[PDB]
Amino acid sequence: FQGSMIDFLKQLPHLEPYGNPFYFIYLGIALLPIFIGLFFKKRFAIYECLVSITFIVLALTGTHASQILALLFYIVWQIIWVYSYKRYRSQRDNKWVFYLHSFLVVLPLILVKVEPTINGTQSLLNFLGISYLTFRAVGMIIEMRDGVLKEFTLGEFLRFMLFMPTFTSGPIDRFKRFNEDYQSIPNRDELLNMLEQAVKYIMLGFLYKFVLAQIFGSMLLPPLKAQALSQGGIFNLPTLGVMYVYGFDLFFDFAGYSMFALAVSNLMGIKSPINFDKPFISRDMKEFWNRWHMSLSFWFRDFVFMRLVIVLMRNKVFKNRNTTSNVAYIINMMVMGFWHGITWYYIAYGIFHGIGLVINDAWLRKKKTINKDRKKAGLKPLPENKWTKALGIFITFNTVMLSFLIFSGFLNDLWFTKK
Amino acid sequence: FQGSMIDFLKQLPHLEPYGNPFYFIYLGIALLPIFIGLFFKKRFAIYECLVSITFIVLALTGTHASQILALLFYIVWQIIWVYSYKRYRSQRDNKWVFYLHSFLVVLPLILVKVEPTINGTQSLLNFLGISYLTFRAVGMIIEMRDGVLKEFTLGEFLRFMLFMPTFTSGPIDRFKRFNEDYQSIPNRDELLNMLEQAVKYIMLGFLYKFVLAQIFGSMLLPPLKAQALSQGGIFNLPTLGVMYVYGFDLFFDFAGYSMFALAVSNLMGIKSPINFDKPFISRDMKEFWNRWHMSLSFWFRDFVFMRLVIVLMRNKVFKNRNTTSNVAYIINMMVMGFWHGITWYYIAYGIFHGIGLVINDAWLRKKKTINKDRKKAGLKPLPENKWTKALGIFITFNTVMLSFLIFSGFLNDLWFTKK
Amino acid sequence: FQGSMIDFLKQLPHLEPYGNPFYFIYLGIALLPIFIGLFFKKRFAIYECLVSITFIVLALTGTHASQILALLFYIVWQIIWVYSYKRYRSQRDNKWVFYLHSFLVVLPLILVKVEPTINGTQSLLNFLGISYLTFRAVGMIIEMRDGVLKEFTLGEFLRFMLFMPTFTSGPIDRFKRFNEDYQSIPNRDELLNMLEQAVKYIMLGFLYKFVLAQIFGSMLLPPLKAQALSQGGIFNLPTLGVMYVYGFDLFFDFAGYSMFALAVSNLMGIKSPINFDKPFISRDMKEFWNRWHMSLSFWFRDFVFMRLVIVLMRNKVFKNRNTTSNVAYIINMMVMGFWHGITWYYIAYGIFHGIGLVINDAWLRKKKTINKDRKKAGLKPLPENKWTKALGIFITFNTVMLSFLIFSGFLNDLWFTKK
Amino acid sequence: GSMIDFLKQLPHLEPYGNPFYFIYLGIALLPIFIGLFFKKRFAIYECLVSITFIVLALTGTHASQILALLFYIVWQIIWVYSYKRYRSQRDNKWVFYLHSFLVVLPLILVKVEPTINGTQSLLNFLGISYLTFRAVGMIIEMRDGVLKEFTLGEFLRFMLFMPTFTSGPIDRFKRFNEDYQSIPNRDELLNMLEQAVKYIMLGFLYKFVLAQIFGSMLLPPLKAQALSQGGIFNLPTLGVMYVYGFDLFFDFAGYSMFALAVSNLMGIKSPINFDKPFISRDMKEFWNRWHMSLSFWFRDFVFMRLVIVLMRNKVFKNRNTTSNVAYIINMMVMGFWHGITWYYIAYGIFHGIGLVINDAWLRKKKTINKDRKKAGLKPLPENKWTKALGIFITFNTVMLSFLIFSGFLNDLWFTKK
Ligand SMILES: CCCCCCCCCCCCCCCCCC(=O)O[C@@H](COC(=O)CCCCCCCCCCCCCCC)COP(=O)(O)OC[C@H](O)CO
Ligand SMILES: CCCCCCCCCCCCO[C@@H]1O[C@H](CO)[C@@H](O[C@H]2O[C@H](CO)[C@@H](O)[C@H](O)[C@H]2O)[C@H](O)[C@H]1O
Ligand SMILES: CCCCCCCCCCCCO[C@@H]1O[C@H](CO)[C@@H](O[C@H]2O[C@H](CO)[C@@H](O)[C@H](O)[C@H]2O)[C@H](O)[C@H]1O
Ligand SMILES: CCCCCCCCCCCCO[C@@H]1O[C@H](CO)[C@@H](O[C@H]2O[C@H](CO)[C@@H](O)[C@H](O)[C@H]2O)[C@H](O)[C@H]1O
Ligand SMILES: CCCCCCCCCCCCO[C@@H]1O[C@H](CO)[C@@H](O[C@H]2O[C@H](CO)[C@@H](O)[C@H](O)[C@H]2O)[C@H](O)[C@H]1O
Ligand SMILES: CCCCCCCCCCCCO[C@@H]1O[C@H](CO)[C@@H](O[C@H]2O[C@H](CO)[C@@H](O)[C@H](O)[C@H]2O)[C@H](O)[C@H]1O
Ligand SMILES: CCCCCCCCCCCCO[C@@H]1O[C@H](CO)[C@@H](O[C@H]2O[C@H](CO)[C@@H](O)[C@H](O)[C@H]2O)[C@H](O)[C@H]1O
Ligand SMILES: CCCCCCCCCCCCO[C@@H]1O[C@H](CO)[C@@H](O[C@H]2O[C@H](CO)[C@@H](O)[C@H](O)[C@H]2O)[C@H](O)[C@H]1O
Ligand SMILES: CCCCCCCCCCCCO[C@@H]1O[C@H](CO)[C@@H](O[C@H]2O[C@H](CO)[C@@H](O)[C@H](O)[C@H]2O)[C@H](O)[C@H]1O
Ligand SMILES: CCCCCCCCCCCCO[C@@H]1O[C@H](CO)[C@@H](O[C@H]2O[C@H](CO)[C@@H](O)[C@H](O)[C@H]2O)[C@H](O)[C@H]1O
């Protein structure tokens, strides 16, 4: 009964998800049948499972391929605790039972994020996309609590949670929208539109991830970081250079992956949510969060921010609505900071963006009352000319790049600050 | 460049039939056109012949490449002794001529299974599928005897006997059914259903052979064998452990191969017989043999068991039907053991399964008699509760595991008896 | 001037025609637009020229790439001496002008086949397929002489004489049939049938040239020749073995090339004449020549044998028809041997097959008169059964293999010279 | 490290250098052609292909020209939109000249810097000689009012056109937009495909066979012999003149046919550059066949406009003198565009004097033939000998002009440069 099982699942192929461009050959061929079936309004639901599982396994068979075993636990864990809650939802509905089931479903993510802090080493039950899978699972539990979701077969649950195109770190879905878009196969014209969009997305993702991302990450970023460390001090010009370069590199890499995921999802007939829609032209933090990682930000607005606001207003803990909104903004942004990983700089980034949103709300209210005062006094309202827009875009870009500098983790290297 | 032809044959590539998963890619592409051809009403004879011969040669070459020659002669032998009977079938059917033709058809198998016993090491005639090929050949000499087969060209004969997805050790087939199933190409929707079933079979075979068969074969079996040998004695708990582990490994490996073969056959538009249908849950041995190796068990039921019962009743050797049935069961299982190989443990396995079958028949008769006795006495019949079903399943499973342990040959190493 | 263009010609890319399976990928990709255009009843007549010229150049750019220059002379020769007849043909029909034009058109072939005998070195005009282009370039003139051929554009001439699929050494065409097949594009059903036949031919050509031809030529033939030379003497068993092996190798290589050429021609929409149709079941010399290199044998029957018979009968040189037929057979076979090449063994092969045809005609006449005599005398006609047919097949096969032994040129090494 | 050396690291694919480049281009352009078959445009795959091939053609040993290209693109966009915003209000007849000068400023700097101290400017790149002609086009078409609206996509798609980027045929805006927006039907598309295949084959023949023979086999030894003999003139001078002229034609026509074929595979038929020029009887009819795109461009936007400017100011008394001056100035400006050296300007002035002499001879011939018809004498016959004489003299003058333009006359002599 030797425990050489880890060695068994290590010589398997390691086809990287969106690695070399030739990958899109294999997947393309593997997606040739399913897409054809969509033209005839027929869904295989078996060959799709085969291709999804094969590509997930090829993606997860890395140097630390043992993570596959974690998956074979994680899935089971979710299947244990989602369905259990459903059984309870058949009989009764209590706040504490829902809280316990949600906490148990999100527990693997909590362990993966916390264990490197306490023990200092990666947790056993960690794999490539556990930061983007639990968001589906807990989401379904939430959809049970509100009563929107009542019944679903296991095939639907597993084909939703373990979606291949958006598995590693991709757009975050919900169960209602995904299921409704999976049941009703779109007609031929919309299918052809989606095919054209998918080809365009594949080409754009090639450009983003294989040209711009490589240039900004593996060519300028290392020498810029080394020069910044050599300069030393609290701040310097190389710090600004690395801030801007890393911000652009992060955006380009994430947008390239998102385009790849959207293209592959379209090739299966499903319209996954978009992530980035020109986020750097944003002229305000609130508008920025409607552009940067749209799936994640919208998910947190739907399930973490709005529900917290409702809870706070139900108990009327805070008198004015503005104070409740500010508190909920800070809590939501801090929690979003936690999701990346509980360190000093990720939590700093979360609180930073929370403070930014609070300042944005305060400035919106103050601008409204100042416009009212000026209009009442006969003066014209504040100018909306190109100069004001340029100033707003510049301020937003500077704040976003400062946030991406803190989030970059470069402040741990520049300043050896333990906490 | 060649030296001896055997070395040149060894030079040829060796592709294990259903070995690495990558193998399924090759056949997949090799089966891509033909399957599409099944959608329409045409079949590519030349392509099918070429792909079948190519994969047969690839499976036959390797360290024992000379076996290819043993195949070729064998083929001629069959063509020598099948068609001859056909000509004789045109004139008359004397029993002794039919017996002689059947014996000459199955003579290569007799020599292959005899030569290792009674001195010697191994016969030159032996090759990969010789154990599962004569069943097809003697599958026609019998049918000619019954008169249900009259005409067939060489193309049909060799296309059936040299079937590629069922060559190495696959679901034993019959001629009439195979010809009737290949003459009529199935419709489009049935073809899509067959494609889905083939994909499910491929996935399940992956699970059955490359995951669980590996675990039960190369992880637990060697340590359990070592512990059992170290313990010694007539028997011990490690013997029970190795019995259970080997039985599971054998079932999983055989089911994986059979599902692979059925999937590849379905991709060729032909529905080969199913070998395994949920064993280990059978209440009775007689109902176990309708689920374990279904193709071979049904073959022996049709062409060996029932025919022998007819022969015995024609000469009315025994007084009652029950004795004839018992003797037929014993002879059928003994012939199965002989087909497996003429050793001590294979014959022990055959005799033990025959004993199980006859005891099952006797117990069924006794239970029917006692139920009649209770019915005529007014007493409630013996309970058929879930506990009785569990008891029957447990007894059948234990007997099957013991039979597999005997068939393993591990008992021979353990005891060294009858060496 | 420098004269270094030959060196330039040696740095062009090289692609052996039907050399590798990957060559068919390029060929199919290039010919797909032509097939699609055929499906819609359209011929580009320019893209075809481009693909044909590119593949001819890639085939002719071997180690002796200078042969390309010879082609750039040969065409400029043939055109000059084809149209020179066409202008004259409209005016008058003097026999000597036709003889002179035919001789001048066949002159490059005469030089290529003669110069290696006189000077001992390859002639300048020689290139890959002159012996299979002079036939078309003299068939055009012969058709002009009969008056069957009339006004035709240069495009038709150059697309007929320089046909890409049958350029190197392929099926020999005529102009009228090829032109009529080129003008009338076949319907969609015939196009599908031709595509299926072409795929079958490609697979069979793979089997013949890349498997059987290699085995019979590069593996057994050199050892057999070496052992035959070591044995020495006028005749020996290794010589018989190498005779049979080389006969099979020659047939398989030529049939593989012919099937490749037929497939590629079918992909262009025209069906070139077949070359081999089971030559080794001939049962007679006449039925052998109606099966062995059918395009060449039929060409020589149409334009060399029949015309010679007509010439001899017009002047009634010989008293009876049989003498004229025998003389024409001998002359035709000697001229075929000449066309192969002016060596002792090629002329021996030609005159040998001529003697064979003569004695076959004598045997047919004697069998006819003997059957008549036996029928008149009441005796049964001589049997025509399995054994008689087998004896005829054996005699024909032995004579053909002796002919291919003489034609092999092995006699020059064994009998004459020293080794 | 990302530097100029990093730009030099990128692969270099010389435009229309080897047939494998054509295989690459055909494989890349096939989807665009099939899409145009069904009357749709991608506007993204086209941009990616164009940018990729431009970069590959630009990433040579001196690959620092991509920065020059980016600076040129920014400069052209800035000044074109500056004029467009200004044209909406009013035209002052001098702001147009200022904008035209600021648009041609990169070109004039690139053509002046080599001949001022020692070297070309840093902003020079591959196709700057054939790109400015498009930019000024826009400005010209804004002055006449025939162009009013265009987005950035159309403008950059027209200026950064891939098939005619390096030295391909010079286009105009209005025609290019009219041809791009209206995709041709299926049958005309097939005809264009056949013409493109014919162009590819003929370009193969022109550039990869004949140009190689006339450039690498005869030109070096002929130049060597001409230099060895020396003197003002010699028979090897005539040999090198003829060989260089044939090499120039068989190379430029091959490249132009390649560009036209690649453009046709993208559904746009760029203007034909060469239509058998050597058979032209007269000098004036020669310029309608040799470098047709460039000659027509200079006829439309440089010659006729200058004639109009001179006539509206009535500087000269009669039309003939104005036409002569316009011809001389047009040919001199073409010579300047080629490069500011002694032999390019000599070539321009020589072609100008050829044009004016041709005009004068045509007028004199018309007058003398009118007098002959009045006097009863039959007009001079032209069936086979007069036409041959005209063709021969035009060909001789063209060959001499090409010899002067060759720059070999500079090596042969040591005249003041
Ligand atoms: C009704 C009132 C009239 C008032 C007077 C009108 C006068 C008009 C003057 C227009 C000046 C335009 C200035 C921009 C073009 C300069 C052309 C030039 O110099 O040649 C170029 C060659 O041509 C081109 O590449 C583009 C030519 C087209 C220019 C079109 C601009 C607008 C013209 C409109 C009116 C045309 C009048 C005649 C223009 C020559 C580029 O130079 P190069 O590299 O050959 O070097 C020569 C350099 O100047 C010497 O150092
Ligand atoms: C449904 C049909 C389609 C399903 C998928 C079909 C395509 C499957 C491709 C499997 C092979 C991928 O081929 C790829 O080759 C590369 C480069 O050699 C290797 O790549 C990998 O090698 C080994 C693991 O094998 C690792 O140590 C290494 O880090 C990694 O790069 C692997 O062998 C495989 O990842
Ligand atoms: C330490 C905390 C982090 C630093 C925080 C910095 C971010 C603060 C907010 C960003 C600046 C917002 O400042 C200013 O906001 C106004 C008011 O909406 C924006 O103005 C805009 O508002 C909205 C768009 O959302 C429109 O309806 C309005 O017409 C337009 O003028 C300006 O574009 C921006 O210049
Ligand atoms: C490695 C082992 C190699 C040995 C295997 C060799 C391949 C098997 C050869 C089979 C015989 C080929 O010769 C065969 O002759 C028979 C004569 O009826 C015909 O056979 C035909 O029979 C059926 C009857 O419906 C046709 O539908 C079919 O198209 C074809 O198979 C063909 O002409 C040819 O297929
Ligand atoms: C080699 C040594 C022996 C090997 C084992 C022998 C075979 C296995 C034990 C005998 C079979 C056990 O299973 C036996 O058949 C079935 C299945 O539960 C039960 O009985 C079943 O069949 C009888 C037939 O009369 C029905 O009336 C009854 O309703 C049904 O439950 C028996 O009560 C049980 O005793
Ligand atoms: C629409 C038209 C389509 C045209 C089809 C494509 C034509 C061009 C094909 C690719 C170019 C030729 O590709 C060819 O590849 C072979 C690989 O064996 C190489 O050529 C080789 O030829 C022989 C045989 O293989 C070798 O012995 C030799 O050493 C080498 O020159 C060159 O790389 C090139 O000659
Ligand atoms: C319209 C035409 C339809 C048929 C089109 C497709 C048929 C041709 C397929 C070509 C497949 C690839 O072509 C060839 O395949 C062989 C098969 O082992 C492999 O390579 C083979 O040839 C190469 C070179 O000759 C050898 O070095 C090698 O040992 C051998 O295996 C490669 O994969 C590729 O060189
Ligand atoms: C240097 C000489 C080279 C030539 C060598 C020999 C060339 C071969 C030709 C010899 C004849 C063989 O062809 C001959 O055909 C005749 C008539 O069809 C048949 O002749 C045979 O069959 C007939 C019945 O048909 C019977 O009378 C008898 O059994 C026999 O004559 C045989 O098929 C074969 O004997
Ligand atoms: C080698 C260096 C290359 C430098 C960069 C070259 C790329 C430059 C991109 C120019 C286009 C940017 O311009 C922006 O693009 C979008 C999206 O394409 C255009 O959007 C649209 O424009 C045209 C206008 O008819 C449409 O036909 C087209 O479908 C679409 O592209 C907008 O008009 C413009 O807002
Ligand atoms: C470097 C200095 C300049 C070099 C020379 C440049 C001019 C070269 C051409 C000079 C001759 C003009 O060429 C002349 O063209 C005219 C019309 O164009 C042709 O035709 C004209 O003359 C013929 C003479 O028979 C008459 O029919 C009629 O007057 C007219 O048609 C002449 O056949 C040709 O001789």
Author numbering:
A (entry chain D), B (entry chain C), C (entry chain B): -3 to 415
D (entry chain A): -1 to 415
Verbatim from the authors:
Through biochemical analysis and cryo-EM imaging, we discover that Streptococcus thermophilus DltB forms a homo-tetramer on the cell membrane. The tetrameric organization of DltB provides a scaffold for catalyzing D-alanyl transfer and regulating the channel opening and closing.
Significantly different from the monomeric crystal structure of DltB16, our cryo-EM structures reveal the tetrameric organization of DltB. In the image processing, application of C4 symmetry to the refinement and reconstruction did not yield better resolution map, indicating that the DltB tetramer adopts a non-4-fold symmetry. This observation is also consistent with the following structural analysis: Four Phe36 residues of the four protomers form an approximate rectangle on the intracellular side, while the four Tyr22 residues on the extracellular side are more twisted. The central hole is surrounded by the transmembrane helix TMH1 from four protomers, which is almost perpendicular to the membrane, with hydrophobic residues Phe18, Ile21, Ile25, Leu28, Ile32, Phe36 facing into the center of the hole. As the tetramer is a dimer of dimers, there are two different intratetramer interfaces: the intradimer interface (A-B interface between MolA and MolB or MolC and MolD) and interdimer interface (B-C interface between MolB and MolC or MolA and MolD).
